[model samples]
Target: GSHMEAVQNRIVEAAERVPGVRGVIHLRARYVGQDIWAHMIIGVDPENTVEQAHEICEAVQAAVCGKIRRIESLHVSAEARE
Candidate 1:
């Protein structure tokens, strides 16, 4: 069975792809029962434009969606967090 590292690596990789983003900061996560509560903080590049930020982040979030093991149960969303 896969561990939480798969989620961590994917989250980090996706966050790094966001335009004008410096990096991603995240809390280590574990699955409790049937739920997953992963916390991640995406870093923004000081010089990144809002347009670039929006687009790249959107795409990155989309990419993360592709990494999810289940499509119907869990969701990967940037807007869902906010």
Candidate 2:
């Protein structure tokens, strides 16, 4: 239980470091049969362009993976501030 929480928090912190990231809008995580699955919805500034959004999303993914150093499945989605 605690390990899962730690991983979730780590992912959130890493994603928040992305330049265009406003914050995390939604996060769903669960452990099913010893497998971990996570879905993150990140909010980005409306002023950010499409390229910027893509870069931020990539950065977020890298950060999350780097920090966790492990994952069965992870999903990161970005949305302009709406």
Candidate 3:
């Protein structure tokens, strides 16, 4: 079975836990030749600066990477949103 929504919601929740993270803009999952991957775009709070967002985003990425082991690859993108 595939856990596309599972990864999406889990990552979104983890990313949202970051102090300056607003939400998750997009989330996707795919499998290529037995390799699983998750691609996500996270929204940063408007009050956060690019520098702060970068650090918080990394934290989110790390959380996802550590929490989910089934996926072999992850692509996380960050953006500021209202």
Candidate 4:
């Protein structure tokens, strides 16, 4: 995961692109991993269904994760031992 300054900037940029996004908050959660990435709330329009918001969230997460690829090394593997 990237640093707060960078990640926050990306998230803010993406959310602001959507017309429905009201506000976003990136607070310092206590007693948790400094790099823990979680979506406390989507903050979209009330008319937007939860399912739609979930889809948007998934898309947003994917976008953010994609950008993280440059800043982070993602290890991919498939192995089974029996």
Give each model's whole-structure lDDT: 0.54, 0.80, 0.75, 0.46
lDDT of 2 by residue, 20-41 (tens): 7889998888887676678888
lDDT for each residue of candidate 4 in 8-62, tens digit (9 for 90 to 100)? 5765566445444444443221113444343423456666766666666555555
The list of candidate 4 runs beyond 4 A from truth reads 1-3, 18-20, 26-40, 70-82
Per-residue lDDT tens digits for candidate 3, residues 1-82, read 5466665677677777766667888888787656568788888777777788778777877888788667688787788788
- RMSD values, in order shown: 5.8, 2.1, 2.0, 12.1
**All candidates in order of TM-score, best leading:** 2, 3, 1, 4
Model 1 over residues 24-69: C-alpha lDDT tens digits? 6444445766445554555565465666556656665566556654
**What is the clash count of model 1?**
0
Off by over 4 Å in 2: 32-35
The CA lDDT at 30 in model 4 is 19
Point out where model 3 deviates above 4 Å.
none
Deviation from native of the Cα of residue 25 in model 3, angstroms: 0.6
- TM-score of each candidate structure, all chains considered together: 0.53, 0.80, 0.77, 0.49
